[PDB]
Design a binder for these strands. Sequence first.
DNA 1: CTCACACGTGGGACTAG
DNA 2: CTAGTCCCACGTGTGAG
Lengths: 63, 63
Amino acid sequence: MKRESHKHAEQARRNRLAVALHELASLIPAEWKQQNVSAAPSKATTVEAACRYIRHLQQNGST
Amino acid sequence: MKRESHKHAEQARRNRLAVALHELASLIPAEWKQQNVSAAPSKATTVEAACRYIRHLQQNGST
DNA sequence: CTCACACGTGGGACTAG
DNA sequence: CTAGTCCCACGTGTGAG
């Protein structure tokens, strides 16, 4: 039963979710992801602010 | 000594990272995605994407 | 303690024999 | 049926502070 690999595999898989996610804040220019309620530089929070630098960025109507 | 049952501490906390991936999905452009090689619609595979957009949105107009 | 975390695990679409 | 892929998510033993 390939769960034997599914391990070696679904690890590589769950890993991808990291390399990249890592590589988001890795260069979230918006360094405020450095300064706030941030209870963890690893997933969630970083991603909360990760959507943020974009959230600033999606400003499309300069007066 | 909830060193087993503390359980919920994971997902009840994980939930954020879920939607973090999700708001990361709200301000990302489907219309963009055509550029990106389809990976599969996953809670990992698209963290890949938010980078793409972001890495991009930065140098907007530069020529 | 409270956090955050990476492992296995059963797994349920989907596909190729 | 049989198993090989996908990627989802829970339940945890652990380090860290």
